[PDB]
Amino acid sequence: KVRCAVVDTNVLMYVYLNKADVVGQLREFGFSRFLITASVKRELEKLEMSLRGKEKVAARFALKLLEHFEVVETESEGDPSLIEAAEKYGCILITNDKELKRKAKQRGIPVGYLKEDKRVFVELL
Amino acid sequence: KVRCAVVDTNVLMYVYLNKADVVGQLREFGFSRFLITASVKRELEKLEMSLRGKEKVAARFALKLLEHFEVVETESEGDPSLIEAAEKYGCILITNDKELKRKAKQRGIPVGYLKEDKRVFVELL
């Protein structure tokens, strides 16, 4: 079956800022549909207008990624809309926001988040 | 042939502090003899007596690792002794010390050092 993921825009900002291929990694786990809410997309467009430097670039890159997302409407606005969308469409919710993860857990919505693996290794080059 | 590595004690402190298996990683590259100088080993024994907390534990763990190193004598003392030993015995020198690496490079001694790889990935567990 077609599996979907709702991805928090703050996670997408990490694509540019940390060279993390979030969408490709989600595809490996079997997710082939990517959803955002109209509210959160609009909030990111507004945020972009006030960001500077590399954060501004990261928001623009996130906005380009969203060109390949489905944009869905919700009753609620902002972060709560991500939960509403994930539950309605039967998606995983990808976020690092601690309150969002808790609420999703409480509603039986599966969650994924970004983790950093640091390994120290011997370099001969 | 039997390949040898001289390993800076500051690198060995990272074994405990960062869970980096420096000796095992060196074995993978074909190094099966591990050398320290009498001077640097003694300096680490003195240092241990003044360290505290987890640094004290890391120095003790480094000292235990040195139980499986060959201890060799040199004319010189301290960091310079690591270069002297590496050149005499034909070893690679493993250090993160920028001056030590330069001097080794200038004398044709191969160098390895510790690097940190950070990858950001999607966690579903």
Side-chain angles (χ1 to χ4, degrees), chain A residues 14 18 20 22 25-26 29 31 92 94 111-124, chain B residues 14 18 20 22 25-26 29 31 92 94 111-124:
Chain A
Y14 256 47
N18 288 276
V22 171
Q25 288 166 13
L26 286 166
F29 283 118
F31 299 99
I92 188 165
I94 310 297
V111 170
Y113 66 101
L114 296 187
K115 202 146 199 150
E116 193 168 18
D117 188 75
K118 285 155 167 152
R119 47 208 184 148
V120 174
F121 68 95
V122 175
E123 179 69 284
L124 303 192
Chain B
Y14 256 47
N18 288 276
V22 171
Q25 288 166 13
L26 286 166
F29 283 118
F31 299 99
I92 188 165
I94 310 297
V111 170
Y113 66 101
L114 296 187
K115 202 146 199 150
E116 193 168 18
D117 188 75
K118 285 155 167 152
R119 47 208 184 148
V120 174
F121 68 95
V122 175
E123 179 69 284
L124 303 192

Side-chain angles (χ1 to χ4, degrees), chain B residues 24 37 39 43 57 76 91 102 111 121:
Chain B
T37 63
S39 178
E43 291 299 322
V57 178
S76 67
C91 304
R102 191 189 63 79
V111 170
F121 68 95

Side-chain angles (χ1 to χ4, degrees), chain A residues 93-97 100-102 104:
Chain A
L93 174 63
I94 310 297
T95 181
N96 279 67
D97 178 87
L100 231 44
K101 298 159 90 184
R102 191 189 63 79

Side-chain angles (χ1 to χ4, degrees), chain A residues 47-61:
Chain A
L47 187 63
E48 184 283 327
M49 296 163 55
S50 64
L51 293 166
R52 294 172 157 271
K54 52 155 175 55
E55 281 188 330
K56 190 178 181 64
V57 178
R60 291 192 174 186
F61 191 92

Side-chain angles (χ1 to χ4, degrees), chain A residues 30-42:
Chain A
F31 299 99
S32 64
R33 274 180 68 196
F34 296 91
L35 271 62
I36 194 62
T37 63
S39 178
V40 174
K41 178 177 192 229
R42 182 67 53 94

Side-chain angles (χ1 to χ4, degrees), chain B residues 83-97 100-101:
Chain B
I83 287 173
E84 185 184 329
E87 191 174 355
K88 175 175 191 186
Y89 291 90
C91 304
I92 188 165
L93 174 63
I94 310 297
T95 181
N96 279 67
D97 178 87
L100 231 44
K101 298 159 90 184

